[PDB]
Amino acid sequence: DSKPVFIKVPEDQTGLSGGVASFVCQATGEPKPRITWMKKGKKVSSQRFEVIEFDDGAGSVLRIQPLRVQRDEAIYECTATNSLGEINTSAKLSVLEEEQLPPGFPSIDMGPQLKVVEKARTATMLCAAGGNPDPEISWFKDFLPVDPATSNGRIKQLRSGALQIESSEESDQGKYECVATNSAGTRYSAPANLYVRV
Ligand SMILES: O=S(=O)(O)OC[C@H]1O[C@](O)(COS(=O)(=O)O)[C@@H](OS(=O)(=O)O)[C@@H]1OS(=O)(=O)O
Numbered sequence: 001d002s003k004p005v006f007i008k009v010p011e012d013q014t015g016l017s018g019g020v021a022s023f024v025c026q027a028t029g030e031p032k033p034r035i036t037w038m039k040k041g042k043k044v045s046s047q048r049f050e051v052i053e054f055d056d057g058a059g060s061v062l063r064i065q066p067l068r069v070q071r072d073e074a075i076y077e078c079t080a081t082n083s084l085g086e087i088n089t090s091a092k093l094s095v096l097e098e099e100q101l102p103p104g105f106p107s108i109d110m111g112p113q114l115k116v117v118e119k120a121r122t123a124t125m126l127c128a129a130g131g132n133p134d135p136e137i138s139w140f141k142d143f144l145p146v147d148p149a150t151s152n153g154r155i156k157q158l159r160s161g162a163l164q165i166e167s168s169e170e171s172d173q174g175k176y177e178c179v180a181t182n183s184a185g186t187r188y189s190a191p192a193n194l195y196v197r198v
Contacts, residue, residue: 102130
């Protein structure tokens with residue numbers, strides 16, 4: 001048995017009105033702990049917000065869309081509990097209007113497109129971004145983060161930003177979004193579907 005310990009924590013984030021923001025939190029322990037979200041010191045309702053679980057309840061994602069300045073700008077709190085102890089950690093969301101954007105805020109220069117692939121062949125989803133400084137890229141599939149380090153060689157992110165998927169199978173089907181981040185803020189691409197045929 002052991003007390004819970006964080007292996008992923010949410011960071012401060014600046015987004016754009018009409019857009020999307022996601023926060024991610026995850027912990028280990030024995031028995032497995034349970035994640036819960038709060039807004040301004042009160043528990044969030046799952047019949048009102050989009051909340052998506054993974055790792056048997058030991059990881060969770062809070063997604064907010066479309067962003068609105070008055071309602072959504074606030075302090076958000078993640079908490080993890082098992083029969084041996086409780087730990088917590090917080091982060092702040094800021095939301096900008098179009099005319100407040102600084103010149104180096106990130107942009108999508110070329111985004112991912114619809115793709116139909118035959119089983120057992122390779123599929124590639126492209127993404128090229130710009131800004132100042134140069135942004136870092138990450139990917140989401142059906143609202144959850146993609147982590148290549150667990151595909152045992154199948155799935156990889158290239159230095160250009162593209163996502164490459166070998167030996168395609170039925171579980172690879174779904175809706176993919178590219179995400180670009182730098183010291184000024186965050187921007188999402190439009191979503192694009194992958195289908196597996198024959
Ligand atoms: O910007 S707000 O924080 O006000 O957001 C809107 C909130 O207005 C409330 O009515 C409560 O008002 S309050 O000022 O006393 O927090 C909540 O609605 S309710 O049905 O769950 O009770 C909303 O909660 S919220 O949207 O999930 O954040």
